[PDB]
Every structure is written in structure tokens, then in C-alpha cells.
């Protein structure tokens, strides 16, 4: 009956967890991850590589879904969506509905859900085994609004929840991370890490 998605980490039977590239904090960087904050900083609409790690290969038809929720208690029940400006920008990639914050880049089998009961948005792809040479698979996400967008996120922090699901949509595994979509991810990461250190 509930409609706030769980954010509880759950490796489950296949040992599912995320990984992120070591991109550093140069002012040219477009996506960078802070382990200390469990937080991804990225530029608007730029590629965000997220690694999917498992201890064992899940069955054919396993899928991976991404969904954003507001991190603060008082905002958790509100659907995370694009702002009144971006949803009207005609920046369709062919597949993503205009209201969806999170897109997957470069995957023909990406499916976008507007949940009929909760009204939440998500994007889901087939979970593919690592290519020869790789130990993991990578999904490329894009975030299509700034954290600061007025009438959208409006400076409120979000989490992305990544779920590993069977072909029916049943939970196999879960992980999550905070996201800030910003003009200078490198600088903003250095700043927030400094603040944490000082605290
Ligand atoms: Zn926006």
C-alpha cells in the first residue's frame, strides 16, 4: 500500500552493489563521485557512468532500475520530476518522456515507467553480463535538470535508488547514492568534502 520507495541497501543473493570511477575534482570534470559523502556530482545532461557489481551472474531477464527520491523527510513523498522549464525544452532523446529527470544514454532497450499508482518515474534496462576484459557492467545515466532548478528540485537534495529486479519486477538487490547536478562538480565536491572534514 506504501508509495515512498525503500532506500535500504540490500546486496541480496547475487552480491549486488554499485561502483564509481575515480574521476578527480579538476574544474574540467563532468561527473565525479565522493565516497565520504556517498554523493555523485555531475553536470547537466552529461554522461554519468555507474558500475554494477555482482558476486554471481543473475538470471537472463534480470533488469536494473533507477529512480530518484528527495533525501529530506519532509520532501520524500513528493515525486522528483523535471522543472517547468526543462520539461518543456524539446530535448527528447527519442525515448525518455520529457518529465523524467533520469535518462539512460545509449541503450535501445531502456524503458521508462510512470507508475500508475505512485506516479513516480524510473528508467529500467536489461542487466547485461560484463564484456570480455571487464569485471563489471557500466550504465550511463544522464540527469536532465540542475539541483537548483526552480519549480523542480529547487536546491533540495535527491537520492538515486538503483534496484536489481527479476523479470517480474521483484527486488533482488538495492543500492543508492546522493546526487548534485551542478555547473562545477569538481569544485562543489571539494567544497562539500571540506565542510565534512571541518565538521
Ligand atoms: Zn530544470
State the distance from the centre of ligand 1 to the C-alpha of 150, rounded, in angstroms. Answer: 7
Per-residue cell: 84: 517547468
Work out the burial of residue 88: count CB atoms within 10 Å of its CB; fewer than 13 is exposed, 13-18 middle, 19 or more buried. exposed
Count of alpha carbons within 13 Å of 117, Cβ hemisphere only? 5
State the distance from the centre of ligand 1 to the C-alpha of 146, rounded, in angstroms. Answer: 6
Residue 83 in marked binding region: yes
d(CA 42, CA 188): 10
Cβ-based neighbours of 110, under 8 Å, separated by 6 or more: 95, 96, 103, 104, 123, 124, 125
State the distance from the centre of ligand 1 to the C-alpha of 174, rounded, in angstroms. Answer: 27
Sheet (strand 48-53) strand order: 17-19, 48-53, 137-143, 102-104
Residue 136 in marked binding region: no
User: Which DSSP letter does residue 182 get?
Assistant: -
Residue 86 in marked binding region: yes
Are the CB atoms for 69 and 177 separated by under 8 Å? no
State the distance from the centre of ligand 1 to the C-alpha of 45, rounded, in angstroms. Answer: 11
d(CA 167, CA 90): 32
d(CA 105, CA 128): 15
Which CA distances in Å does 44 have to 9, 98, 119, 143, 152?
A: 27, 15, 24, 6, 14
State the distance from the centre of ligand 1 to the C-alpha of 162, rounded, in angstroms. Answer: 22
Residue extents of the structural domains in the chain: 3-197
Residue 149 in marked binding region: yes
d(CA 20, CA 138): 9
For domain 3-197, the CATH architecture is Sandwich (2.60)
Are the CB atoms for 31 and 105 separated by under 8 Å? no
State the distance from the centre of ligand 1 to the C-alpha of 10, rounded, in angstroms. Answer: 31
Method: X-ray
d(CA 141, CA 50): 7
Amino acid at each position: 500500500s506504501s508509495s515512498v520507495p525503500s532506500q535500504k541497501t540490500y546486496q541480496g543473493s547475487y552480491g549486488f552493489r554499485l561502483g564509481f570511477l575515480h574521476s578527480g575534482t579538476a574544474k574540467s570534470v563532468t561527473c565525479t563521485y565522493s565516497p565520504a559523502l556517498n554523493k555523485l556530482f555531475c553536470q547537466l545532461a552529461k554522461t554519468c557512468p555507474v558500475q554494477l557489481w555482482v558476486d554471481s551472474t543473475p538470471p537472463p531477464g534480470t533488469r536494473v532500475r533507477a529512480m530518484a527520491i528527495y533525501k529530506q523527510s519532509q520532501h520524500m513523498t513528493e515525486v522528483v520530476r523535471r522543472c517547468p522549464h526543462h520539461e518543456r525544452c524539446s530535448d527528447s532523446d527519442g525515448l525518455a518522456p520529457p518529465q523524467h529527470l533520469i535518462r539512460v544514454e545509449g541503450n535501445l532497450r531502456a524503458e521508462y515507467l510512470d507508475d500508475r499508482n505512485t506516479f513516480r518515474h524510473s528508467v529500467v534496462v536489461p542487466c547485461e553480463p560484463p564484456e570480455v576484459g571487464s569485471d563489471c557492467t557500466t550504465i550511463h545515466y544522464n540527469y536532465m535538470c540542475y539541483s537548483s532548478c526552480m519549480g523542480g528540485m529547487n536546491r533540495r537534495p535527491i537520492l538515486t535508488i538503483i534496484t536489481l529486479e527479476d523479470s517480474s519486477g521483484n527486488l533482488l538487490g538495492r543500492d543508492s547514492f546522493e546526487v548534485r547536478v551542478c555547473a562545477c562538480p569538481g569544485r562543489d565536491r571539494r567544497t562539500e568534502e571540506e565542510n565534512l572534514r571541518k565538521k
